[PDB]
Amino acid sequence: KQFTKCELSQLLKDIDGYGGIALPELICTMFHTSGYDTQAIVENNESTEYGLFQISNKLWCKSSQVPQSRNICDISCDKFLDDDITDDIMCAKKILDIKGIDYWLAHKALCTEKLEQWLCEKL
Ligand SMILES: [Ca+2]
Ligand SMILES: [Zn+2]
């Protein structure tokens, strides 16, 4: 599933301000991270990132590729490739709590300025 800017904004409205993070900033971050695609899979060296939030099997979810993973979100990585982003959001919040917004390189690089374009009026 590939969401549009406003569709996703509506789904994450209740997350505004979570961990001091503003909604438009999070939308911008996700645009440059996965392009709003729930099925994005990106192989890094000996690890892989999954889904809309690009959650890593190196530390956050369990995958057969990295059997030694701490699996902090306590969930198999396949759950981040389906149509329900509810469990993806639960894990992203745990990343925000523990590690913070810098888990996503896009935030500091491109998402602290030129923010009006990320606002949504109605879809
Ligand atoms: Ca999911
Ligand atoms: Zn990444």
UniProtKB/Swiss-Prot annotation:
<dbReference type="GO" id="GO:0050830">
    <property type="term" value="P:defense response to Gram-positive bacterium"/>
</dbReference>
<dbReference type="GO" id="GO:0005509">
    <property type="term" value="F:calcium ion binding"/>
</dbReference>
<dbReference type="GO" id="GO:0000139">
    <property type="term" value="C:Golgi membrane"/>
</dbReference>
<dbReference type="GO" id="GO:0005796">
    <property type="term" value="C:Golgi lumen"/>
</dbReference>
<feature type="binding site">
    <location>
        <position position="49"/>
    </location>
    <ligand>
        <name>Zn(2+)</name>
    </ligand>
</feature>
<feature type="binding site">
    <location>
        <position position="88"/>
    </location>
    <ligand>
        <name>Ca(2+) 2</name>
    </ligand>
</feature>
<feature type="binding site">
    <location>
        <position position="81"/>
    </location>
    <ligand>
        <name>Ca(2+) 1</name>
    </ligand>
</feature>
<keyword id="KW-0494">Milk protein</keyword>
<feature type="domain" description="C-type lysozyme">
    <location>
        <begin position="1"/>
        <end position="123"/>
    </location>
</feature>
<keyword id="KW-1015">Disulfide bond</keyword>
<feature type="binding site">
    <location>
        <position position="38"/>
    </location>
    <ligand>
        <name>Ca(2+) 1</name>
    </ligand>
</feature>
<dbReference type="GO" id="GO:0050829">
    <property type="term" value="P:defense response to Gram-negative bacterium"/>
</dbReference>
<feature type="glycosylation site" description="N-linked (GlcNAc...) asparagine">
    <location>
        <position position="45"/>
    </location>
</feature>
<dbReference type="GO" id="GO:0005989">
    <property type="term" value="P:lactose biosynthetic process"/>
</dbReference>
<keyword id="KW-0479">Metal-binding</keyword>
<keyword id="KW-0325">Glycoprotein</keyword>
<feature type="binding site">
    <location>
        <position position="84"/>
    </location>
    <ligand>
        <name>Ca(2+) 2</name>
    </ligand>
</feature>
<feature type="binding site">
    <location>
        <position position="87"/>
    </location>
    <ligand>
        <name>Ca(2+) 2</name>
    </ligand>
</feature>
<feature type="disulfide bond">
    <location>
        <begin position="6"/>
        <end position="120"/>
    </location>
</feature>
<dbReference type="InterPro" id="IPR019799">
    <property type="entry name" value="Glyco_hydro_22_CS"/>
</dbReference>
<feature type="binding site">
    <location>
        <position position="116"/>
    </location>
    <ligand>
        <name>Zn(2+)</name>
    </ligand>
</feature>
<keyword id="KW-0422">Lactose biosynthesis</keyword>
<dbReference type="InterPro" id="IPR023346">
    <property type="entry name" value="Lysozyme-like_dom_sf"/>
</dbReference>
<feature type="binding site">
    <location>
        <position position="82"/>
    </location>
    <ligand>
        <name>Ca(2+) 2</name>
    </ligand>
</feature>
<keyword id="KW-0964">Secreted</keyword>
<feature type="binding site">
    <location>
        <position position="83"/>
    </location>
    <ligand>
        <name>Ca(2+) 1</name>
    </ligand>
</feature>
<feature type="disulfide bond">
    <location>
        <begin position="73"/>
        <end position="91"/>
    </location>
</feature>
<dbReference type="GO" id="GO:0005615">
    <property type="term" value="C:extracellular space"/>
</dbReference>
<keyword id="KW-0106">Calcium</keyword>
<comment type="function">
    <text>Regulatory subunit of lactose synthase, changes the substrate specificity of galactosyltransferase in the mammary gland making glucose a good acceptor substrate for this enzyme. This enables LS to synthesize lactose, the major carbohydrate component of milk. In other tissues, galactosyltransferase transfers galactose onto the N-acetylglucosamine of the oligosaccharide chains in glycoproteins.</text>
</comment>
<dbReference type="GO" id="GO:0003796">
    <property type="term" value="F:lysozyme activity"/>
</dbReference>
<dbReference type="GO" id="GO:0007165">
    <property type="term" value="P:signal transduction"/>
</dbReference>
<keyword id="KW-0732">Signal</keyword>
<dbReference type="GO" id="GO:0007267">
    <property type="term" value="P:cell-cell signaling"/>
</dbReference>
<dbReference type="GO" id="GO:0004461">
    <property type="term" value="F:lactose synthase activity"/>
</dbReference>
<dbReference type="GO" id="GO:0006915">
    <property type="term" value="P:apoptotic process"/>
</dbReference>
<comment type="similarity">
    <text>Belongs to the glycosyl hydrolase 22 family.</text>
</comment>
<feature type="disulfide bond">
    <location>
        <begin position="61"/>
        <end position="77"/>
    </location>
</feature>
<feature type="glycosylation site" description="N-linked (GlcNAc...) asparagine; atypical; partial">
    <location>
        <position position="71"/>
    </location>
</feature>
<dbReference type="Pfam" id="PF00062">
    <property type="entry name" value="Lys"/>
</dbReference>
<comment type="subunit">
    <text>Lactose synthase (LS) is a heterodimer of a catalytic component, beta1,4-galactosyltransferase (beta4Gal-T1) and a regulatory component, alpha-lactalbumin (LA).</text>
</comment>
<dbReference type="GO" id="GO:0032991">
    <property type="term" value="C:protein-containing complex"/>
</dbReference>
